[PDB]
Write a protein that binds this ligand. Sequence first.
Ligand SMILES: Nc1ncnc2c1ncn2[C@@H]1O[C@H](COP(=O)(O)OP(=O)(O)NP(=O)(O)O)[C@@H](O)[C@H]1O
Ligand SMILES: [Mg+2]
Ligand SMILES: [Zn+2]
Length: 319
Amino acid sequence: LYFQGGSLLELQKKYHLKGAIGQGSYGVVRVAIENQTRAIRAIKIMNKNKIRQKDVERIKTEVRLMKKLHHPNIARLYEVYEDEQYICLVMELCHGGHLLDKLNVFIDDSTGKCAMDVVKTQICPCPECNEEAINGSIFRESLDFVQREKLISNIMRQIFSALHYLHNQGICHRDIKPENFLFSTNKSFEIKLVDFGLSKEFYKLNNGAGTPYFVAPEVLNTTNESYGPKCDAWSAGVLLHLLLMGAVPFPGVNDADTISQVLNKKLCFENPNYNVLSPLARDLLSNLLNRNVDERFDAMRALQHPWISQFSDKIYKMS
Ligand SMILES: Nc1ncnc2c1ncn2[C@@H]1O[C@H](COP(=O)(O)OP(=O)(O)NP(=O)(O)O)[C@@H](O)[C@H]1O
Ligand SMILES: [Mg+2]
Ligand SMILES: [Zn+2]
């Protein structure tokens, strides 16, 4: 666990450490102010001793990848600092909380339809969030059918943008799920992918999983790593289904039950329940949650699909 990082003495000179914005398995993530720029960062602190007591390879991979990636929907990793006991990762700070922190998705009992509320989250202790909170006024905003599809489509555009980029960089993510996306702020719906712990470069697959709800059947049905990045497109489809329908398509009582449903369940988007979706949403869902890998969309095809693209590629300015 050596990352060729700077010294922690340098870290404490360069950054002013503030309050926690999360806790991982190996330490906290703290807001930090870069002294010379006033940039507000997240510093992820990981205890090397606790790591060693498997995740070592995953961590080196996550760090090496996030450091080299440059995309507006992927959290940047700027700098690494370390000593014998700690790794400190200076990254882009997301103030808005997890996808499902801000988006409240549930089935409305009276109509049987999925409902969505947007929540103003109170997670970040940074100076900017502090300032806005004490000067401002607050809640839960309910979204109609049109608002929901527009917002969800926008979310999916960002997820597929990130995936297209990743796949073209030759990286399979393998853990696309709501928890791994954070909102940049409370002021917009910009999202960032913040976790690469299970990621692998294509050229290393088979060189010697994910959260069950979101894992593709071909991943579950393969002894080794003989599968492609369309596994990520499937995971994104599962995320989309949850956002649109209020529940995952394979809602097992436990992991074993979930794995069986993913493997056995042929999704039929001609079940009358999907009448609640626009024809385009229905069609995008069916093309992401296609068990036939050859036929399933990749990120590019998802991006070109009219549910995502229909307000783009215009000629005359009609606004
Ligand atoms: N760039 C960031 N900006 C803001 N918050 C972050 C950032 N990165 C991580 N966090 C928060 O820190 C928490 C822990 O990070 P995480 O990457 O989950 O560590 P972990 O040990 O992998 N825990 P888990 O993923 O649950 O097994 C996350 O839930 C985020 O809410
Ligand atoms: Mg993580
Ligand atoms: Zn903040």
